[PDB]
Design an enzyme around this catalytic site. Structure first.
Site, PDB file in Angstrom:
ATOM      1  N   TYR A  98       0.846  -1.038   0.049  1.00 52.55           N
ATOM      2  CA  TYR A  98       0.150   0.034   0.038  1.00 52.55           C
ATOM      3  C   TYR A  98       1.072   1.238  -0.170  1.00 52.55           C
ATOM      4  O   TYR A  98       1.929   1.232   0.498  1.00 52.55           O
ATOM      5  CB  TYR A  98      -0.787   0.056   1.112  1.00 52.55           C
ATOM      6  CG  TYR A  98      -0.294   0.307   2.372  1.00 52.55           C
ATOM      7  CD1 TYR A  98       0.324  -0.759   3.140  1.00 52.55           C
ATOM      8  CD2 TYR A  98      -0.278   1.482   3.051  1.00 52.55           C
ATOM      9  CE1 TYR A  98       0.909  -0.556   4.344  1.00 52.55           C
ATOM     10  CE2 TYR A  98       0.416   1.765   4.331  1.00 52.55           C
ATOM     11  CZ  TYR A  98       1.153   0.691   4.905  1.00 52.55           C
ATOM     12  OH  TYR A  98       1.675   0.843   6.284  1.00 52.55           O
TER      13      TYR A  98
ATOM     14  N   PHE B  24       2.101   9.750   3.634  1.00 52.48           N
ATOM     15  CA  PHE B  24       2.500   9.230   5.021  1.00 52.48           C
ATOM     16  C   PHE B  24       2.787   8.132   5.157  1.00 52.48           C
ATOM     17  O   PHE B  24       3.654   7.717   6.186  1.00 52.48           O
ATOM     18  CB  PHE B  24       1.343   9.786   5.775  1.00 52.48           C
ATOM     19  CG  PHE B  24       0.205   8.660   5.743  1.00 52.48           C
ATOM     20  CD1 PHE B  24      -0.093   7.689   6.135  1.00 52.48           C
ATOM     21  CD2 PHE B  24      -0.914   9.377   4.663  1.00 52.48           C
ATOM     22  CE1 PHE B  24      -1.119   6.985   6.075  1.00 52.48           C
ATOM     23  CE2 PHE B  24      -2.040   8.484   4.723  1.00 52.48           C
ATOM     24  CZ  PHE B  24      -2.247   7.626   5.228  1.00 52.48           C
ATOM     25  N   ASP B  25       2.720   7.110   4.053  1.00 56.44           N
ATOM     26  CA  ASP B  25       3.314   5.701   4.468  1.00 56.44           C
ATOM     27  C   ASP B  25       3.245   4.866   3.085  1.00 56.44           C
ATOM     28  O   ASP B  25       2.614   5.216   2.276  1.00 56.44           O
ATOM     29  CB  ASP B  25       2.374   4.973   5.619  1.00 56.44           C
ATOM     30  CG  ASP B  25       2.879   3.729   6.312  1.00 56.44           C
ATOM     31  OD1 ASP B  25       3.962   3.402   5.862  1.00 56.44           O
ATOM     32  OD2 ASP B  25       2.144   3.094   7.089  1.00 56.44           O
TER      33      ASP B  25
ATOM     34  N   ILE C 105      -7.366   0.166  10.838  1.00 56.42           N
ATOM     35  CA  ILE C 105      -8.647   1.012  10.757  1.00 56.42           C
ATOM     36  C   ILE C 105      -9.637   0.460  10.130  1.00 56.42           C
ATOM     37  O   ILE C 105      -9.535  -0.516   9.239  1.00 56.42           O
ATOM     38  CB  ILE C 105      -8.161   2.237  10.008  1.00 56.42           C
ATOM     39  CG1 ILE C 105      -7.479   2.182   8.484  1.00 56.42           C
ATOM     40  CG2 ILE C 105      -7.467   3.260  10.880  1.00 56.42           C
ATOM     41  CD1 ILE C 105      -7.548   3.503   7.725  1.00 56.42           C
TER      42      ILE C 105
ATOM     43  N   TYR D 172      -8.848   7.617  11.699  1.00 64.84           N
ATOM     44  CA  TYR D 172      -8.266   7.976  13.006  1.00 64.84           C
ATOM     45  C   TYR D 172      -9.096   8.852  13.646  1.00 64.84           C
ATOM     46  O   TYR D 172      -8.714   9.258  14.789  1.00 64.84           O
ATOM     47  CB  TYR D 172      -6.757   8.227  12.947  1.00 64.84           C
ATOM     48  CG  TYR D 172      -6.013   7.117  12.354  1.00 64.84           C
ATOM     49  CD1 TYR D 172      -5.606   6.175  13.141  1.00 64.84           C
ATOM     50  CD2 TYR D 172      -5.649   7.116  10.864  1.00 64.84           C
ATOM     51  CE1 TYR D 172      -4.874   5.239  12.723  1.00 64.84           C
ATOM     52  CE2 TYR D 172      -5.004   5.807  10.637  1.00 64.84           C
ATOM     53  CZ  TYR D 172      -4.476   4.934  11.478  1.00 64.84           C
ATOM     54  OH  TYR D 172      -3.682   3.688  11.277  1.00 64.84           O
TER      55      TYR D 172
ATOM     56  N   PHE E  79      -5.733   5.764  -0.067  1.00 64.67           N
ATOM     57  CA  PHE E  79      -4.832   4.738  -0.122  1.00 64.67           C
ATOM     58  C   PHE E  79      -4.846   4.260  -1.192  1.00 64.67           C
ATOM     59  O   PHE E  79      -6.025   3.848  -1.957  1.00 64.67           O
ATOM     60  CB  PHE E  79      -5.011   3.429   0.847  1.00 64.67           C
ATOM     61  CG  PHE E  79      -4.787   3.864   2.487  1.00 64.67           C
ATOM     62  CD1 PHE E  79      -5.771   4.430   3.257  1.00 64.67           C
ATOM     63  CD2 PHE E  79      -3.379   3.572   2.871  1.00 64.67           C
ATOM     64  CE1 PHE E  79      -5.289   4.737   4.462  1.00 64.67           C
ATOM     65  CE2 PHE E  79      -3.170   3.735   4.307  1.00 64.67           C
ATOM     66  CZ  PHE E  79      -4.231   4.093   5.134  1.00 64.67           C
TER      67      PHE E  79
END
Ligand SMILES: C=C[C@H]1CN(Cc2ccccn2)C(=O)[C@@H]2CCC[C@H]1N2[S@](=O)c1cc(Cl)cc(Cl)c1
Length: 128
Positions: free
Chosen positions: A45, A55-56, A75, A101, A118
């Site tokens: 991902y 962010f990731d 999540i 979140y 995502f």
């Protein structure tokens, strides 16, 4: 870009039909079967915030992310979203904070009240 496109053109996959998780299938996966609750799922991902920042990324780690489906190890949107995917599928998810979140956010990079994007690829799924 892709986040705007899934915002405006995605399908609501929530059971409540509250538009909290929107999806586009980018690459069709294999056959008809989706994972079942408790399966070990392997994904790649990348995530972006609404300010455009990545962010990731699992790709950047050179290893997939592994979790047990439907157990709240991720999540809510991921449990819902990965459950809809076939092996080999690539999808985009656009997730309101109530399925991510929330008001708390998540240090260091995810602010309060954050809508997330995502791209996910379902690599494999196995029962244990
Ligand atoms: C290892 C990173 C997971 C983290 N989690 C579960 C989780 C566990 C503990 C605290 C916050 N989130 C998740 O539910 C989701 C979805 C799966 C991929 C990653 N996240 S998000 O991409 C994420 C990415 C990064 Cl770098 C930080 C945080 Cl707090 C969250």
């Amino acid at each position: 870009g892709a986040p705007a496109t899934v915002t405006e053109q995605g399908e609501d996959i929530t059971s409540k039909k509250d538009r909290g998780v929107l999806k586009i299938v980018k690459r069709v996966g294999n056959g008809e079967e989706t994972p079942m609750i408790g399966d070990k799922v392997y994904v790649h991902y990348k995530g972006k915030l609404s300010n455009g920042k990545k962010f990731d990324s699992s790709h950047d780690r050179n290893e997939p992310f592994v979790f047990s489906l439907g157990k709240g190890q991720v999540i809510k949107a991921w449990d819902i979203g990965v459950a809809t995917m076939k092996k080999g599928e690539i999808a985009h998810l656009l997730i309101k904070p109530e399925y991510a979140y929330g008001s708390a956010g998540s240090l260091p990079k995810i602010p309060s009240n954050a809508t997330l994007f995502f791209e996910i690829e379902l690599l494999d799924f196995k029962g244990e």
